[PDB]
Design a protein around this ligand. Sequence first.
Ligand SMILES: *[C@@H]1O[C@H](CO)[C@@H](O[C@@H]2O[C@H](CO)[C@@H](O[C@@H]3O[C@H](CO[C@H]4O[C@H](CO)[C@@H](O)[C@H](O[C@H]5O[C@H](CO)[C@@H](O)[C@H](O)[C@@H]5O)[C@@H]4O)[C@@H](O)[C@H](O)[C@@H]3O)[C@H](O)[C@H]2NC(C)=O)[C@H](O)[C@H]1NC(C)=O
Ligand SMILES: *[C@@H]1O[C@H](CO)[C@@H](O[C@@H]2O[C@H](CO)[C@@H](O[C@@H]3O[C@H](CO)[C@@H](O)[C@H](O)[C@@H]3O)[C@H](O)[C@H]2NC(C)=O)[C@H](O)[C@H]1NC(C)=O
Ligand SMILES: *[C@@H]1O[C@H](CO)[C@@H](O)[C@H](O)[C@H]1NC(C)=O
Ligand SMILES: *[C@@H]1O[C@H](CO)[C@@H](O)[C@H](O)[C@H]1NC(C)=O
Ligand SMILES: [Cu+2]
Ligand SMILES: [Cu+2]
Ligand SMILES: [Cu+2]
Ligand SMILES: [Cu+2]
Length: 499
Amino acid sequence: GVGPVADNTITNAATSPDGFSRQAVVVNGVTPGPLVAGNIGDRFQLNVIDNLTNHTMLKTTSVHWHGFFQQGTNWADGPAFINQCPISPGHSFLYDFQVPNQAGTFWYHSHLSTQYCDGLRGPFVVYDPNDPHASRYDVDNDDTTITLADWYHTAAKLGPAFPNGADSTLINGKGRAPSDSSAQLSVVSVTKGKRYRFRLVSLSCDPNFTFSIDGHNNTIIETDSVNSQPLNTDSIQIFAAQRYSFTLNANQAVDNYWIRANPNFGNVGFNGGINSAILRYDGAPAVEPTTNQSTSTQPLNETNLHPLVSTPVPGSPAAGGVDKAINMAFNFNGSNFFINGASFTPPSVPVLLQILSGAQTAQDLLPSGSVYTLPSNASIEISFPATAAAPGAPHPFHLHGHVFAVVRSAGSTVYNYSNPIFRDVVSTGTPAAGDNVTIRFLTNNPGPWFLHCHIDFHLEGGFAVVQAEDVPDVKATNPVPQAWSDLCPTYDANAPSDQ
Ligand SMILES: *[C@@H]1O[C@H](CO)[C@@H](O[C@@H]2O[C@H](CO)[C@@H](O[C@@H]3O[C@H](CO[C@H]4O[C@H](CO)[C@@H](O)[C@H](O[C@H]5O[C@H](CO)[C@@H](O)[C@H](O)[C@@H]5O)[C@@H]4O)[C@@H](O)[C@H](O)[C@@H]3O)[C@H](O)[C@H]2NC(C)=O)[C@H](O)[C@H]1NC(C)=O
Ligand SMILES: *[C@@H]1O[C@H](CO)[C@@H](O[C@@H]2O[C@H](CO)[C@@H](O[C@@H]3O[C@H](CO)[C@@H](O)[C@H](O)[C@@H]3O)[C@H](O)[C@H]2NC(C)=O)[C@H](O)[C@H]1NC(C)=O
Ligand SMILES: *[C@@H]1O[C@H](CO)[C@@H](O)[C@H](O)[C@H]1NC(C)=O
Ligand SMILES: *[C@@H]1O[C@H](CO)[C@@H](O)[C@H](O)[C@H]1NC(C)=O
Ligand SMILES: [Cu+2]
Ligand SMILES: [Cu+2]
Ligand SMILES: [Cu+2]
Ligand SMILES: [Cu+2]
């Protein structure tokens, strides 16, 4: 829609995606924000204009472009106090980066506190003119992007620290809450006889969703920005921050069909058309579907996903057969999450600025115990053993600046060192199954990269660490613009009520 070169204006506005009016953080007037798009090889120049006025939802902001490597532009990655100080109200900041070696489905969101739950989130697509999946579909545009979101009637800072589900699931920005069962539902239009590349994006801040379309099967062709071999499914459980592209063939009778996105907790099911949208074939009447849900007989299993092209797993085919192995031991005390004994507290000086100011060892870098220094050009293995010590399972963990191989998926005891799927957000599963979800990546990208649970309320509680990669090369590799250098002084000069 907008981009690669565009203004993104951030404001507070009244919205009613489920008929319930509340103040939210919006992008160019809307939540979810507009589709940002471009092509592989593009330079993106996204000018984020901070016109926020509401301290409760934060007047400052910082935008993360989810899934992008940001090689040589660590400064524009987004996480507050990791890669930048927040943009201040009444100021603008230009995110200027390239996407030379990636295509697929991404998203953007505030990476400051829990601000993205309040509305600052939208889809981001990078098209491939030579897309290897192009022969599998006919249509791929603005109207084939499907966004999923949890929506709350009480703002992130005003409700419980860990809410027990959303008031409504939104599909393409609309959904129903119990307060209004006649609220406008989103309609996705299809012309019979065409195949559509639907890009499913979870903008969720907490819950995962089990996505299905009545009377239609789906062919998965992309997993978080990674091209997969075609996998036919009839349902997709999608965790917060994950993406899938699936091909839908509009080959059924001209009719209305229920699109379903059932959350794992909160208001579950479909009473009164909650958790629902409409698949309308051209020529079908402007009414609700009356189609019935069928049992999923081909649900998506992550272990069934494999890259479209041969993609070697970092290291050697053995447990710990890497240059560096890291285990993440989880703890939770009622209010804060801990990884290996440390609950993340954002430092005063952004980690990247600390590095630029000379800090290159874990010892010198702040916060103490939360920063892991990684060797350059090395294979890394990280395990996230599921434990009842950290409730809120299944936790979807996300690694910035990298795609990783999922050598062991949730609900599986298999270690796949041959052809596992690569992605950027992974469910760590449940302690009930004795899950030990394990990932592998190569250190090809100098800079500090955030590694955290993508349930934003959990991130807020400190469920995060920093992977500081190739620290002695970070400054030379990531030259910073004057505008970036100016962010921290401006932010630190703010009255705390203007934050
Ligand atoms: C900054 O942002 C924060 C967070 O978004 C705002 O916090 C809100 O604070 C107020 C208290 O001042 C709370 O108000 C409560 O709202 C309850 C629900 O209100 C809805 O339902 C009402 C009955 O149907 C309806 O009248 C009301 O509409 C009105 O308010 C809307 C905005 O909320 C507005 O868009 C409409 O035009 C209309 O004026 C709501 O739809 C209500 O039941 C309580 O009695 C109480 O009034 C809010 O809950 C807080 N919001 C959230 C999301 O948590 C804060 O106001 C913002 N500051 C400024 C200056 O805007
Ligand atoms: C989506 O994929 C599923 C799973 O492959 C398909 O379900 C299959 O549908 C066929 C045809 O409807 C079923 O076979 C038929 O069964 C009925 C009743 O037993 C019988 O009367 C017919 O003669 C025929 O054999 C099949 O059982 C079923 N498979 C499973 C495992 O559920 C579905 O058709 C696909 N949907 C579309 C629209 O492509
Ligand atoms: C949890 O631990 C943090 C320190 O990391 C502390 O600030 C907080 O008070 C604790 N909360 C409890 C005891 O629930
Ligand atoms: C998970 O895997 C790591 C590394 O292989 C291992 O050290 C750890 O003990 C495992 N945890 C569990 C609970 O299986
Ligand atoms: Cu993200
Ligand atoms: Cu990210
Ligand atoms: Cu979590
Ligand atoms: Cu992040």
